[PDB]
Design a protein around this ligand. Structure first.
Ligand code: CLA
Ligand code: CLA
Ligand code: CLA
Ligand code: CLA
Ligand code: CLA
Ligand code: CLA
Ligand code: CLA
Ligand code: LHG
Ligand code: ZEX
Ligand code: BCR
Ligand code: BCR
Ligand code: SF4
Ligand code: CL
Lengths: 141, 50, 73, 69, 73, 737, 80, 39, 139
């Protein structure tokens, strides 16, 4: 599999470059630990590491782990914002709290987003997530 | 008075001004005696001189 | 190079003209009574869904292509 | 038929609030083509370019409103 | 090739988005519901109702010309 | 006449945005509210209708602006003392480049900490701070730290003064209207006494360490600036005129002081800067003339002038009632004063840019070509922006503060009465200039492309010699000794003379003027005339035209009066500002491109020991700058190789901004080519999608207004283009060497 | 000339007539609204098409509509 | 109590959150740099 | 004929062009209680006489902008101005206010023109009126 590419520790361009990888931070070992981390990847003929997003489990660090972490965080952000918008709708001036943000209820929801997909499927199953087409405002069709 | 800038032909609401460039006596006697404006000329003589 | 570029430019012009003359059809030639409940009027019915989903996928593509290109640069 | 305080849905097929819910403020007397005053929480587009708000009330007929209560 | 293919995808999607929004709002929108009475090509509906420059479907053709040229480039 | 506690100081109104505008204080309904808020903050004439409170707000805002400028200057002195190499550069000027910004090593950005000299890693600063600090006599990091601390204290003083003059003790209107005293206090005060104090500083402090550093004394061996004033024997040791004291000053015998106050001219041939004795004598003469000027007008003692009487006496047979009424305009309208001040200050900043390169006043600034190019271009851009703002506030005065009953048959009324003649003749001039400069370039491109170089406009072909500028250059060359007998050298060697060759580099030579200079100067004349035409038509037609007779009722800032009358979009004065911004941008881009190419081609370079100079681009301006293709290939394409081959080096940030400006300019075209109806309908579709998942915001989202769309477009266009040119210019001139 | 039409949602606020800078519109008596007046456009040959009347109209989906049509010297606002 | 609501205005919260997230990212980079995948 | 003294004016370039003597011009007459300064709609300031004032302008919009200024920018509001259209044959046609009453106020005898008995949204489709030469709003 992946015959056009090579493992990095065999690709001699990768060794010739990773002998001289520049240290990003003040740690002198930064280029060396970069080389040690990138040697386990799949490098091209030019020596730079290439990532596979097909869904290979051994390439889970290439796509799968950061994608599911981004999905978890994006669901946290979206559910916190959605629950804040649902809660502040029943107020005297819901536009005021949208532009001068009420801190404590926002903080209460911010430390409340660690169970978001269960809340999402519960709100979907209880009809609190999707409205009807007749209920929403529509342009002249 | 001493004001050399006046209304064009005495009408202040016509969009022009009586200026020493536009309506001096030299301007009228020069432009009006150019062949395109010279009085009594046949148009072939005007065109010929131009 | 000249042939490929010429034909892709002509293709872009023709596709834009197709969508423009479809808009002209909707302005001048479309009968909402004769086309009631068929595919044309149904496309009119959920036009917000189509426009919003195209906008979402355009934002998706542009965001991530520009992010990867700028990260690489 | 409708009275003040009810919530209704706009069915004019041309208004900004078609699909939005509005509240009945008052109903004018008979002989009036569009008697019922409907107020809305969301303003419309009305105003010169650069205006920060629009109008939030409109005049409708009885058949253009659907009672939702 | 992969990055520029996703850029090409973005260009195709955005040009289609402009053209489809123009074709499906040619008859009317919430900002201008009697657009079919004004025709395919007209300048605007004035500065009223917030301002309505480039509201016709002709203007959406005109906007999509730029994105078509961008994708073809 | 000072009020006592007009406005209380409370923290409550900080938390309610939109307090200043009556419509904004109701709360947000559409997103335009937010965009209105920042748009309506500083329009003090619109919030309150009384001139008094507007003047109070302006005075306190001026103090706040001065505080901001002092914070910036304090930060500059702090970054020049802690995170700089002013120590090290000062002992060795021409081995070490100036660098006053140190960047943390993070995410690989420590590559930007480039080797500038003496074991330093930082960004090579091109603002010229080191050369001015050397010209002022700075020699230690502790004194720069003291200056930074003093700048922080003065910023706190400015903030306290603004708070005091708005909230506690605030002046009345006739304090502001007393402009007769204000001009005396600004001429004999600020400018005159400031230049007298700086001349005293020059003579006492800046001259000794400068002349000792030019002599060869190490900076540690020059002790400290105060011990000169502790012991006056050091001046008589160095300038032997300091023996008679202050006696020849008061006894009309000023020729005793002709040893530290001179009329040499030219440049110091150790540094390339101006002579410090020349600048001190200039500052002293400027001080005396400004003190004399600041006793013109009657203030409190019945002696002086009335500016009203002077204006009212100036009238002629052509101009009716003359300057009658201009005092009332300039004492009641802040906008009219802002217009004329912005015009003169922008012209002054442009004059500063043009005078600073040809007479470099700072040591080693001239041989730093990056610093010279940066300072010229920065001051040009500042001046052009201020001139556009002048046209803006002239139109704003015309819309808001003009009154026809109180201007009858004066100059301003006659301007409004013959604006058609003015604008039509300016239109004809602009077309004539565009043809007879740019079509000369087009002619040259076509004749070179057709293989007819003998038919071009060039020095080797049909010649366009700028003979008047050459004659004036000749008269400046024969000035010092014939028409300026006491002047030793010429005012600048750009007019004619010999080449100053500080280190291996060039500082100034005779800038010769041929056909290409003629062509590019008429291009400058054309572009300046078009920018002036746009802004002057915006001023003269801000109130009415034959198209829209009631334009003053629509205001200064409105998109249009509808699609009717053929179409009336961009009729407002604000839209004339919008268009003049692009045309000023075009004008100044060409001005700075002319400067960069001519300085690299016929001035800058490397001097041989025999006396020959190898220029940076080897004199290609005479043959390549006559075509558009030459500007494209030999100027843009050739010199952009430094900015695009910067990746992987310390100049790579200049690469990134070279991309980044290219983004923003193109991003601008989205706002510039489109209209808000499309964007509003698209927003309706996205709001329907938000309605489906109940994420509709309470503040309703709208498209930007037409004016705001134009503003975003012009802002992004100018930002992207200026960032692109900045990156290109800096990566070229940090690689010229 | 341009066409100015007035539809039956007019509530007689007279704001379109006040906003019109070319004296196109009047208010005539009516019975369809509580104000008992409806806008009218007898002078559409003087209409320039500026749509100020549309901007002034407070009814949602405006009761006055201007349609730009045939272009004349008066309609293009020409002083020459 | 108006300063508490002045901080509660939208630009102050969004800049505070941006500084917090940027500080987290910069600190995670300056502790553990050069991560393209999961080792 | 049209009567009134011309307001005293120095002259301007913004005034009448050849359209005035070729196609049409417009006239505005108003009575003034005193001599005060007004703003010309063609740029600049003019002085209106005491009594009758007759001003010639290029467009109807200029006359109506002047009339708006007369009604709104003077403490005694000049509310009696008449705007006429003047043809080069000499015929003067009275324009504004047409019935003697300003059009923002209702008057009997005014006929409803441009009024539609249908709503804005019940205009018929364009496809129903093809090859007829008439728009949806004209039917
Ligand atoms: C280089 C120029 C440029 C760019 C970046 C865009 C970008 C966009 N256009 Mg576009 N446009 C342009 C030129 C450009 N246009 C021109 C010249 C025209 C002709 C007039 C148009 C006409 C046009 C139309 C007609 C339409 C678009 C649409 C879009 C959006 C599509 C979504 C997308 O691609 O990904 C998302 C966005 C991007 C990749 C760009 C923004 C990403 C930025 C850089 C992220 C960083 C933001 C930054 C943090 C902000 C802080 C600012 C701070 C420094 C002050 C997007 C906002 C469509 C749309 O809205 O679809 C939803 C649409 O209908 N545009
Ligand atoms: C207004 C002008 C100005 C500008 C553009 C800068 C810019 C900068 N300063 Mg600086 N500074 C200024 C004024 C200015 N300063 C003043 C007036 C002082 C005196 C109080 C300082 C004192 C100062 C110190 C002590 C340090 C900086 C540092 C920095 C750099 C990183 C900023 C940082 O830590 O973010 C922090 C962001 C927030 C707190 C939010 C950056 C180049 C740092 C640096 O260069 O690292 C070596 C650093 O250590 N500055
Ligand atoms: C802690 C002291 C204090 C307090 C309680 C107030 C309180 C008030 N001021 Mg005030 N002011 C202060 C200091 C203070 N000010 C200072 C130091 C100055 C001199 C610059 C002024 C100048 C000033 C003017 C000219 C005006 C007010 C007004 C007001 C009132 C309305 C609130 C407001 O402006 O919106 C809240 C506004 C903000 C929070 C804006 C913050 C500042 C922005 C971001 C610009 C930053 C520049 C800044 C002014 C100076 C540089 C900052 C520095 C770090 C370098 C309010 C009662 C206005 C008024 O009367 O209301 C009708 C008014 O016209 N003040
Ligand atoms: C604001 C500017 C300024 C200031 C503060 C000073 C201050 C001073 N000058 Mg001075 N000076 C100035 C401008 C200034 N000068 C200018 C412009 C000239 C040129 C005409 C001179 C020419 C001058 C001479 C010739 C001498 C001084 C001297 C002095 C010192 C003693 C004078 C005294 O106490 O009586 C004092 C430090 C005397 C001294 O002892 O020098 C240190 C001295 O001999 N000055
Ligand atoms: C001495 C200088 C001076 C002064 C005192 C004023 C004062 C004023 N101007 Mg003015 N102006 C100036 C220079 C000046 N201007 C210049 C140089 C120009 C030419 C560009 C203009 C153009 C101009 C226009 C076109 C308008 C004004 C307006 C105003 C008034 C309100 C300002 C306002 O809305 O604030 C709020 C200001 C803003 C919201 C602008 C902020 C956004 C800018 C464009 C960002 C610029 C980019 C930035 C430098 C870098 C971005 C970095 C980013 C990537 C992080 C006020 C009387 C306005 C007005 O109401 O007139 C009465 C108006 O319409 N002026
Ligand atoms: C490169 C693009 C470009 C060009 C050529 C022009 C050209 C012009 N602009 Mg302009 N403009 C541009 C971009 C451009 N603009 C942009 C981007 C903006 C947006 C902000 C504006 C905004 C703008 C304003 C706001 C104004 C102008 C003005 C002008 C005119 C200046 C007078 C002049 O030079 O006449 C001479 C004409 C030229 C130099 C054009 C080139 C002519 C060539 C060299 C000769 C061709 C020979 C022959 C005719 C070819 C015929 C071929 C045959 C087969 C028929 C001129 C027509 C001003 C104006 O009208 O003032 C009088 C004015 O007020 N423009
Ligand atoms: C028109 C062009 C021109 C210009 C710009 C100058 C410029 C200058 N001349 Mg000058 N000069 C000129 C023509 C010009 N000259 C001509 C045609 C002659 C006759 C041949 C002279 C003769 C002349 C002499 C003799 C001297 C100058 C000096 C000067 C310098 C400063 C004094 C000064 O002019 O104050 C202007 C002052 C006055 C006009 C006052 C005159 C006295 C009245 C009666 C009181 C200055 C650089 C002086 C110098 O060398 O300084 C460096 C000096 O001594 N000039
Ligand atoms: C580049 C240098 C070499 C070329 C120079 C060419 C000069 C061009 C022609 C002369 C312009 C004459 C104006 C002054 C003469 C002048 O000031 O007259 C004086 C006259 C004012 O006369 P009064 O006696 O009424 O003046 C009393 C005053 O105190 C004001 O009340 O002004 C006018 O008549 C205004 C009309 C100017 C109409 C001319 C417009 C100028 C357009 C040309 C601008 C070109 C400048 C080019 C050089 C920068
Ligand atoms: C849940 C949530 C929301 C609601 C969200 C909605 C409404 C989602 C609507 C969704 C629909 C209607 C359809 C979804 C289609 C979704 C799809 C198709 C799949 C995307 C592909 C996924 C796993 C597979 C991806 C491949 C398969 C495999 C994993 C490979 O390795 C990689 C790769 C990319 C090839 C918000 C937005 C309102 C707020 C949030 O906080 C919560
Ligand atoms: C791959 C492959 C395949 C498959 C194929 C396919 C499946 C295809 C498809 C294709 C397609 C799928 C295509 C598409 C296209 C589309 C388009 C491009 C569209 C367009 C549109 C338009 C243009 C529209 C228009 C309009 C309007 C707008 C309105 C009115 C109407 C109308 C219609 C006119 C096969 C098997 C062979 C083999 C292998 C390979
Ligand atoms: C433009 C600009 C700039 C510059 C500026 C400058 C640098 C200036 C200077 C200025 C100056 C430089 C000034 C000064 C002045 C001074 C004053 C104002 C003072 C006064 C006071 C007083 C009161 C005094 C007193 C006294 C006496 C009288 C005697 C003796 C003793 C004493 C001294 C105490 C900058 C770059 C920054 C920024 C940008 C722009
Ligand atoms: S600015 Fe926009 S709304 Fe106004 S006339 Fe022009 S296109 Fe129409
Ligand atoms: Cl060439």
């Amino acid at each position: 599999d992946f015959a056009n590419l090579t493992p990095c520790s065999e690709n001699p361009a990768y060794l010739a470059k990773s002998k001289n990888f520049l240290n990003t931070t003040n740690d002198p070992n930064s280029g060396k630990i970069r080389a040690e981390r990138y040697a386990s990847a799949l490098c091209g003929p030019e020596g730079y590491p290439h990532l596979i997003v097909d869904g290979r489990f051994t390439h889970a660090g290439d796509f799968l782990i950061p994608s599911i972490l981004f999905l978890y965080i994006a669901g946290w952000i979206g559910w916190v914002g959605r629950s804040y918008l649902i809660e502040i709708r029943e107020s005297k001036n819901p536009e005021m709290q949208e532009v001068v943000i009420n801190v404590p209820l926002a903080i209460k929801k911010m430390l409340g987003g660690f169970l978001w997909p269960l809340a999402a499927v519960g709100e979907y199953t209880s009809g609190k997530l999707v409205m009807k087409d007749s209920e929403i405002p529509t342009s002249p069709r | 008075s001493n004001q050399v800038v006046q209304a064009y032909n005495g009408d202040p609401f016509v969009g022009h001004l009586s200026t020493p460039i536009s309506d001096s006596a030299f301007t009228r006697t020069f432009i009006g005696n150019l062949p395109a404006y010279r009085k009594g000329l046949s148009p072939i003589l005007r065109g010929l001189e131009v | 190079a000249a042939l490929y570029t010429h034909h892709q430019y002509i293709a872009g012009f023709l596709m834009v003209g197709a969508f423009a003359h479809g808009a002209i059809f909707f302005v001048r030639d479309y009968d909402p009574v004769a086309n009631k409940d068929n595919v044309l009027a149904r496309m009119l019915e959920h036009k917000e869904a189509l426009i919003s989903h195209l906008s979402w996928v355009s934002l998706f593509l542009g965001f991530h292509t520009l992010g990867l290109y700028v990260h690489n640069d | 038929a409708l009275n003040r305080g009810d919530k209704v849905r706009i069915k004019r097929t041309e208004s900004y609030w078609y699909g939005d819910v509005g509240t009945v403020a008052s109903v004018e007397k008979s002989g009036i083509l569009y008697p019922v005053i409907v107020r809305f929480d969301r303003v419309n587009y009305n105003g010169f370019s650069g205006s920060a708000s629009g109008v939030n009330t409109n005049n409708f007929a009885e058949n253009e409103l659907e009672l939702v209560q | 090739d992969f990055l520029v293919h996703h850029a090409i995808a973005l260009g195709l999607h955005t040009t289609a988005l402009i053209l489809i929004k123009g074709a499906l709002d040619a008859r009317g929108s919430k900002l201008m519901p009697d657009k079919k009475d004004f025709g395919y090509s007209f300048p605007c509906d004035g500065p009223g109702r917030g301002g309505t420059c480039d509201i016709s479907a002709w203007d959406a053709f005109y906007l999509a010309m730029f994105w078509m040229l961008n994708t073809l480039g | 006449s000072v009020d006592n506690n007009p406005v209380p100081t409370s923290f409550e109104k900080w938390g309610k945005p939109g307090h200043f505008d009556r419509t904004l204080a109701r709360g947000p309904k559409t997103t335009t509210w937010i965009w209105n808020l920042h748009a309506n903050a500083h329009d003090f004439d619109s919030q309150t209708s009384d001139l008094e409170d507007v003047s109070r707000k302006i005075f306190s805002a001026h103090f706040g602006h001065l505080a901001v400028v002092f914070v910036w200057l304090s930060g500059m002195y702090f970054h020049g003392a802690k995170f700089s190499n002013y120590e090290g550069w000062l002992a060795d000027p021409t081995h070490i480049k100036p660098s006053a910004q140190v960047v943390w090593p993070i995410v690989g950005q420590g590559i930007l900490n480039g080797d500038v000299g003496g074991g330093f890693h930082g960004i090579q600063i091109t603002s010229g701070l080191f050369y001015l600090w050397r010209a002022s006599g700075f020699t230690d990091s502790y004194q720069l730290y003291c200056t930074a601390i003093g700048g922080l204290v003065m910023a706190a003083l400015m903030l306290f003064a603004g708070w005091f003059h708005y909230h506690v003790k605030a002046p009345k209107l006739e304090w502001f209207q007393n402009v007769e005293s204000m001009m005396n206090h600004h001429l004999a005060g600020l400018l005159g006494l400031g230049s007298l104090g700086w001349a005293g500083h020059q003579i006492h402090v800046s001259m000794p360490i400068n002349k000792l550093l030019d002599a060869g004394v190490a900076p540690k061996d020059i002790p400290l600036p105060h011990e000169f004033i502790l012991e006056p024997s050091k001046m008589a040791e160095l300038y032997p005129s300091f023996a008679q004291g202050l006696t020849p000053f008061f006894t009309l015998n000023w020729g005793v002081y002709s040893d530290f106050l001179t009329f040499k001219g030219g440049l110091n041939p150790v540094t390339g800067g101006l002579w410090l004795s020349d600048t001190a004598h200039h500052h002293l003469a400027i001080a005396v003339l400004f003190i004399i000027a600041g006793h013109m007008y009657r203030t409190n003692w019945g002696i002086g002038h009335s500016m009203k009487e002077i204006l009212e006496a100036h009238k002629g047979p052509f101009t009716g009632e003359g300057h009658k009424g201009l005092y009332e305009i300039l004492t009641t309208s802040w906008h009219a004063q802002l217009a004329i001040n912005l015009a003169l200050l922008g012209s002054l900043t442009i004059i500063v840019a043009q005078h600073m390169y040809a007479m470099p006043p700072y040591p080693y600034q001239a041989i730093d070509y990056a610093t010279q190019l940066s300072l010229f271009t920065h001051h040009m851009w500042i001046g052009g922006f201020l001139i556009v703002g002048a046209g803006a506030h002239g139109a704003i005065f015309m819309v808001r503060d003009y009154d026809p009953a109180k201007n009858v048959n004066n100059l301003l009324d006659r301007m409004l009465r013959h604006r058609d003649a003015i604008i039509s003749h300016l239109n004809w001039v602009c077309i004539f200039l565009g043809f007879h400069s740019f079509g000369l370039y087009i002619h040259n491109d076509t004749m070179r492309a057709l293989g007819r170089p003998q038919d071009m406009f060039s020095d080797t072909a049909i010649q366009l010699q700028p003979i008047f500028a050459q004659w004036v250059q000749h008269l400046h060359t024969l000035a010092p000794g014939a028409t300026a007998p006491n002047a030793l050298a010429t005012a600048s060697y750009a007019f004619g003379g010999e080449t100053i060759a500080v280190a291996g580099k060039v500082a100034m030579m005779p800038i010769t003027l041929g056909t290409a200079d003629f062509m590019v100067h008429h291009i400058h004349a054309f572009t300046i005339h078009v920018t002036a035409l746009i802004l002057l038509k915006g001023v003269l037609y801000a109130r009415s035209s034959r198209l829209v007779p009631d334009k003053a009722n629509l205001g200064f800032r409105f998109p249009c009066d509808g699609p009717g009358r053929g179409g009336t979009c961009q009729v407002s004065g604000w839209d004339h500002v919008f268009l003049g911004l692009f045309w000023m941008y075009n004008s100044l881009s060409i001005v700075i491109f002319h400067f960069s190419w001519k300085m690299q081609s016929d001035v800058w370079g490397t001097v041989s020991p025999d006396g020959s100079v190898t220029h940076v681009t080897l004199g290609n301006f005479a043959q390549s700058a006559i075509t558009i293709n030459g500007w494209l290939r030999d100027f843009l394409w050739a010199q952009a190789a430094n900015v695009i081959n910067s990746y992987g080096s310390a100049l790579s940030a200049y690469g990134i901004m070279f991309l980044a400006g290219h983004f923003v300019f193109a991003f601008s075209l989205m706002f510039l080519f489109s209209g808000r109806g499309y964007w509003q309908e698209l927003i309706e579709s996205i709001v329907w999608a938000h309605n489906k998942l109940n994420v509709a915001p309470a503040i309703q989202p709208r498209a930007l207004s037409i004016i705001q769309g134009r503003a975003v477009g012009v802002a992004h266009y100018l930002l992207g283009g200026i960032v692109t040119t900045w990156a290109f210019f800096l990566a070229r001139s940090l690689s010229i060497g | 000339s341009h066409s100015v039409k007035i539809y039956d949602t007019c509530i007689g606020c007279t704001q379109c007539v006040r906003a019109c800078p070319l004296d196109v519109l009047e208010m005539v008596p009516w019975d369809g609204c509580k104000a008992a007046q409806i806008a009218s456009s007898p002078r559409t040959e003087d209409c320039v098409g500026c749509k100020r009347c549309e901007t002034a109209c407070p009814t949602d989906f405006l009761s006055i509509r201007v349609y730009l049509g045939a272009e004349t010297t008066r309609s293009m606002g020409l002083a020459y | 109590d108006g300063l508490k609501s002045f901080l509660s205005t939208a630009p102050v919260m969004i800049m505070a959150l941006l500084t917090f997230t940027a500080g987290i990212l910069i600190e995670f980079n300056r502790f553990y740099p050069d991560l393209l995948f999961h080792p | 004929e049209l009567s009134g003294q011309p307001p005293k004016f120095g002259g301007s370039t913004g005034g009448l062009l050849s359209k005035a003597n070729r196609e049409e011009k417009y006239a505005i007459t108003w009575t003034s209680a005193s001599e005060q300064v007004f703003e010309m709609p063609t740029g600049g300031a003019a002085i209106m006489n005491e009594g009758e004032n007759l001003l010639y302008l290029a467009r109807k919009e200029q006359c109506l902008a002047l009339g708006t200024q007369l009604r709104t920018k003077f403490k005694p509001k000049i509310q009696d101005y008449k705007i006429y259209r003047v043809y080069p044959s000499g015929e003067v046609q009275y324009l504004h206010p047409a019935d003697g009453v300003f059009p923002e106020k209702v008057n009997e005898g005014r006929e409803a023109q441009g009024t539609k008995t249908r709503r804005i949204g019940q205009n018929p489709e364009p496809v129903t009126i093809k090859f007829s030469g008439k728009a949806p709003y004209e039917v």
